[PDB]
Design a protein around this ligand. Structure first.
Ligand code: HEC
Length: 153
């Protein structure tokens, strides 16, 4: 997979993740969150309907701008999750969860996996598919069902 770790086992900040496959957009009444899946893992999903070993997701938070509508403003947070059956053999679903920054806190270059109770517990109890909240990510179910990442006529 594309995840890179430092010698202490902390996840390094992913590079160029805004070029990954956007799977979801959530609006909080105000923030916008964009969820990405790395491209090789997205290709595997489209083919199999499963998250491969090595899947990386990123959730990027922005503030909201006003249009005279609303649009993406300033970047204010970044979180990530990584699936790895060998590195995370003792986590639910073999997923680890990371904060790179949240509003009012500084960006770190490398993030430590959080304890199971802080993130994985909610994901494993509420996510539709293998601890990823695919119920909110319409690109994923469509891609598996049609083999395509878009509408077809
Ligand atoms: C329930 C109380 C949650 C806890 C605790 C955490 N997360 Fe979560 N996560 C939750 C939801 C409902 C969603 C869908 C998008 C949204 O914000 O509404 C998510 C999504 C993510 C993602 C995107 C990939 C995915 O699994 O869907 C990531 C990378 C993510 N969340 C990270 C994350 C971290 C680092 C957490 C602990 C600090 C954490 N989540 C806790 C619900 C809940």
């Amino acid at each position: 997979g594309v995840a890179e770790f430092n010698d202490k086992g902390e996840l390094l900040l992913p590079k160029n993740y805004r070029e990954w496959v956007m799977v979801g957009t959530q609006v909080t009444p105000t923030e916008i969150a964009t969820v990405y899946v790395d491209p090789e893992s997205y290709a595997h999903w489209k083919k199999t309907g499963e998250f491969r070993d090595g899947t990386v997701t990123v959730k990027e938070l922005v503030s909201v701008g006003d249009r005279k509508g609303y649009f993406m403003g300033d970047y204010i947070g970044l979180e990530a999750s990584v699936k790895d059956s060998q590195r995370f053999a003792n986590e639910p679903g073999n997923w680890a969860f990371y904060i790179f920054y949240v509003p009012d806190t500084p960006l770190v270059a490398a993030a430590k996996n959080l304890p199971t109770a802080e993130c994985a517990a909610c994901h494993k109890e509420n996510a539709k598919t293998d601890m990823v909240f695919t119920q909110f990510y319409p690109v994923l179910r469509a891609a598996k069902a049609t083999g395509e990442s878009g509408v077809v006529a």
